[PDB]
């Protein structure tokens, strides 16, 4: 029962349209619980989960001002990169960032990360050790010296190993009825005859949480991965996801190919079949 806590930051420069747009969103696993948009009536860290709005006013002030300031640090960071790369003033550039902590089944941290990307391509990431840096290009190496002398990687190790865990833990105990409630997938098989012998047999998996799911088709135990089309896992909207896998099977052979589902919500993996 391994979980996670990640924070997403988007800072896109819009020259002429005033000042850049900052959109920072907080997630626990696949559950969106906090958000901040720079362009808002009065910008503040907003609750998106019932367990997070339970937290006190002094919490909401802290969280708000950090994002309010991050936006400004990002606004300057954009101008800094414009000099680094010697690029156009009028151009619209993107600054992406994501930091978070991956916690185990018994509450202790396994993976910590602080990676960021300029214009859609990786810039500088904090390595698994939580004490090292890897720069993508030569301009990413300027930030490296800056963050290796100011020991930025140390505080991050303290946050990720410390408070990141303490809070992901608080949040896990806070909204357990929505977070630790493993939703099993409501599955079934749909038959599409096509024409005569070749028929498409689709395997549906809807209403499951989290997004991690493995769907396969098997002809007498052999994986038909080469001849199976699989859609990317998509959100239904109601806190749950959906995904399908289909195979072209000739008529008569329809009662050989079996569908296989693997999910947290299931105790034993299901070997469901098409039944008229």
């Amino acid at each position: 029962g391994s979980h996670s806590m990640r924070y997403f930051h988007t800072s896109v420069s819009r020259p002429g349209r005033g000042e850049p747009r900052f959109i920072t969103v907080g997630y626990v696993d696949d559950t969106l619980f906090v958000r901040f948009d720079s362009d808002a009536a009065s910008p503040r860290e907003e609750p998106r989960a019932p367990w997070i709005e339970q937290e006190g006013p002094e919490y909401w002030d802290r969280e708000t001002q950090i994002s309010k300031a991050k936006a400004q640090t990002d606004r300057e960071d954009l101008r800094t990169l414009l000099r680094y790369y010697n690029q156009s003033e009028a151009g619209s550039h993107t600054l992406q960032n994501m930091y978070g902590c991956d916690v185990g089944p018994d509450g202790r941290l396994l993976r910590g990360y602080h990676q960021n990307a300029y214009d859609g391509k990786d810039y500088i990431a904090l390595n698994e050790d939580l004490s090292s840096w890897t720069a993508a290009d030569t301009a990413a190496q300027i930030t490296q010296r800056k963050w290796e002398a100011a020991r930025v990687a140390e505080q991050l190790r303290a946050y990720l190993e410390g408070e990141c865990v303490e809070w992901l833990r608080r949040y896990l105990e806070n909204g357990k009825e929505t977070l630790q409630r493993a939703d099993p997938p409501k599955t079934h098989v749909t038959h599409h005859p096509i024409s005569d012998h070749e028929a498409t047999l689709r395997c549906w998996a809807l209403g499951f949480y989290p997004a991690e799911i493995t769907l396969t088709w098997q002809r007498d135990g052999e994986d038909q991965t080469q001849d199976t089309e699989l859609v990317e896992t998509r959100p239904a909207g109601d806190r749950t996801f959906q995904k399908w896998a289909a195979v072209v099977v000739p008529s008569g052979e329809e009662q050989r190919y079996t569908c296989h589902v693997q999910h947290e919500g299931l105790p034993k993996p299901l070997t469901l079949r098409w039944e008229p």
């Binding site: 924070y7 969280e63 300031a69 640090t73 960071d77 800056k146 963050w147 930025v152 505080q155 408070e163």
Partner: peptide
């Protein structure tokens, strides 16, 4: 809960 040491690039 966020980290507040976002030092300039």
């Amino acid at each position: 809960f966020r980290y507040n040491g976002l030092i300039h690039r």
